[PDB]
Amino acid sequence: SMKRTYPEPTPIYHITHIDNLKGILRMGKLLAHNQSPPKQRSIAYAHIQERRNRAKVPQPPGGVLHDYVPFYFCPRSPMLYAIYSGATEYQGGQEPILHLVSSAQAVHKAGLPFVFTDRHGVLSHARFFRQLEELAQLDWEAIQASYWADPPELREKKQAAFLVYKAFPWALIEEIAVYSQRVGEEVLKILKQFPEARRPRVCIRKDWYY
Numbered sequence: 001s002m003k004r005t006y007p008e009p010t011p012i013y014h015i016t017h018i019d020n021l022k023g024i025l026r027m028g029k030l031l032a033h034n035q036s037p038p039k040q041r042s043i044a045y046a047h048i049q050e051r052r053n054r055a056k057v058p059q060p061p062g063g064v065l066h067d068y069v070p071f072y073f074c075p076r077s078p079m080l081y082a083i084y085s086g087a088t089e090y091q092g093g094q095e096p097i098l099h100l101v102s103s104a105q106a107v108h109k110a111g112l113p114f115v116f117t118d119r120h121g122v123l124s125h126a127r128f129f130r131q132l133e134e135l136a137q138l139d140w141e142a143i144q145a146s147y148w149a150d151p152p153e154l155r156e157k158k159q160a161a162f163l164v165y166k167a168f169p170w171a172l173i174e175e176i177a178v179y180s181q182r183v184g185e186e187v188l189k190i191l192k193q194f195p196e197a198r199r200p201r202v203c204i205r206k207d208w209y210y
C-alpha cells in the first residue's frame, strides 16, 4: 500500500561545454536549439540531434524538442556517459562539461512555460506532463539509479527530461558543478568577465561524473 511521491524541491541539471558559458552570460540565457543559440561547441549525439528536430511535444506550448532547453533530473546522466565513452562526435570528454543546476519549482515560480517527460523525449512511448504534481508519475528509482545497465528501460527512464520553452534565463542557475578544480578556476575567470551576470556557486563534484 503506497502513494507515488517526488523529491521537493526537484533539482534539474543541464550539461554544456565550458566554451558555451561566455555566450550564455552575454545573452543572459540559454537559447533552445531552434532559436539560433550563440553555441560555441556541440557535445550533441548526432542521432539524438536529428531526432530532436522531429520529436513532437503533445503538451502546450507544443512544437518539437529542439524548441526547448532540456534538463535532466539527475547528474551523471546517460548523455554524460555518451560523452565520457567518446560515443558523441565531440571527443573532448567530460572534464570541460559543466552541470548547470536549477529546480523545477523555480521555473514554475518564474512563470516560464515548461513540459516534462517520464523518459527520453525522442522515444515514441514518452509520456509528457506540464503540472508539478505529475512529477509523481516519473520513475524516481530509475532517475536516481547508479546501476542502470539492465533492464533496458532503466537507461530510457533515467533520461526523463524537464524542457523549458524557447529560453532558460541564466539567473535561475543556482550552481555550476565542475569535474575539477582547474575547470572551476576557468569558470570563475569567465564569470568575472561578465560582472553584471548572476554569479552562482561554483562546486567541484567529481562524483557527478564517470
Ligand SMILES: [Cl-]
Binding pocket: 065, 070, 120, 121, 122, 159, 161
Ligand atoms: Cl529529451
